């Protein structure tokens, strides 16, 4: 599976049936039938003590893997019931400014997007978390071209060293908290993971608002490689999949 004519997104139902599954993402988010619910609380990310490890070239995006072994980094609140532990944090781009994240807002697509990922505690490990409909928990953060952001500088002077797929480099005291808006208002759904095995297992917490990086760092993020080193040469563009039926899904909003 990849992202190519011969691979991308339109292929994957053959070897995932679940790509046709009920609760599918990316989706588009329509501000005006999102509902909005004043019962939810409001998020609770404690990264204070968090502690990033490496990051890693797969060949389908860049990752930012952190020690999940204890409770440093989790996000607790919101549509959330326990405690969920940060465990890699990695980003979808585009070609054009006009395109690269996955989930849209009123078919409005961003720069990039975001995706830190954190698995229930109440299952053990992640692995035992995807087993079940509310294992994981996905922030979403849309970026667009504006002023740099200074927390994302550290991860683009690093990618010369991941540049080809399987490659990986020591990342450590790497602050996430650097990665985000203001604002924690969102909007939540139920959905899948958005890369094969695309497991119907996350609660998607979609920010709304975005995170300015200048042209340099989104130039920087776009010259990495999907394909090994010593193969013909993919740049790592466009590794989004498109918006998904919403089917029997409401949209919940933490704001009005
Ligand atoms: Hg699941
Ligand atoms: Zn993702």
């Given at each position: 599976?990849?992202?190519?004519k011969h691979?991308?997104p339109?292929?994957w139902?053959?070897?995932?049936?679940?790509?046709?599954?009920?609760?599918?993402?990316?989706?588009?988010?329509?501000?005006?039938?999102?509902?909005?619910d004043?019962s939810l609380?409001?998020?609770?990310?404690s990264?204070d003590?968090?502690?990033?490890l490496?990051?890693?070239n797969n060949?389908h995006?860049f990752?930012?893997?952190?020690?999940?072994?204890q409770?440093?980094?989790?996000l607790?609140?919101?549509?959330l019931?326990?405690t969920?532990?940060?465990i890699?944090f990695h980003?979808?781009?585009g070609?054009?400014?006009?395109?690269?994240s996955?989930?849209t807002?009123?078919?409005?697509?961003?720069?990039?997007e975001?995706?830190?990922?954190h698995?229930?505690?109440?299952?053990?490990?992640?692995?035992?978390?995807?087993?079940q409909p509310?294992?994981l928990?996905?922030?979403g953060?849309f970026?667009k071209?504006?002023?740099a952001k200074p927390?994302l500088?550290?991860?683009?002077?690093?990618?010369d060293?991941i540049?080809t797929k399987?490659?990986s480099?020591?990342?450590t005291?790497?602050?996430?908290?650097?990665?985000?808006?203001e604002?924690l208002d969102?909007?939540?759904?139920?959905?899948?993971?958005?890369?094969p095995?695309?497991?119907?297992?996350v609660t998607?917490?979609?920010?709304?608002?975005?995170?300015?990086?200048?042209?340099?760092?989104?130039?920087?993020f776009?010259?990495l490689?999907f394909?090994?080193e010593?193969?013909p040469e993919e740049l790592?563009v466009d590794?989004?999949?498109?918006a998904?039926?919403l089917?029997?899904?409401?949209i919940?909003?933490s704001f009005?």
């Amino acid at each position: 599976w990849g992202y190519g004519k011969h691979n991308g997104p339109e292929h994957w139902h053959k070897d995932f049936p679940i790509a046709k599954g009920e609760r599918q993402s990316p989706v588009d988010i329509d501000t005006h039938t999102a509902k909005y619910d004043p019962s939810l609380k409001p998020l609770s990310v404690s990264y204070d003590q968090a502690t990033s490890l490496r990051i890693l070239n797969n060949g389908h995006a860049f990752n930012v893997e952190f020690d999940d072994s204890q409770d440093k980094a989790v996000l607790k609140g919101g549509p959330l019931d326990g405690t969920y532990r940060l465990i890699q944090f990695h980003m979808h781009v585009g070609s054009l400014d006009g395109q690269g994240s996955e989930h849209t807002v009123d078919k409005k697509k961003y720069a990039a997007e975001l995706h830190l990922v954190h698995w229930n505690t109440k299952y053990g490990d992640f692995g035992k978390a995807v087993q079940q409909p509310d294992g994981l928990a996905v922030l979403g953060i849309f970026l667009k071209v504006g002023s740099a952001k200074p927390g994302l500088q550290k991860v683009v002077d690093v990618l010369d060293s991941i540049k080809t797929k399987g490659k990986s480099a020591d990342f450590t005291n790497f602050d996430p908290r650097g990665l985000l808006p203001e604002s924690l208002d969102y909007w939540t759904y139920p959905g899948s993971l958005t890369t094969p095995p695309l497991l119907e297992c996350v609660t998607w917490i979609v920010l709304k608002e975005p995170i300015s990086v200048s042209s340099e760092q989104v130039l920087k993020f776009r010259k990495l490689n999907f394909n090994g080193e010593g193969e013909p040469e993919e740049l790592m563009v466009d590794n989004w999949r498109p918006a998904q039926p919403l089917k029997n899904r409401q949209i919940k909003a933490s704001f009005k």
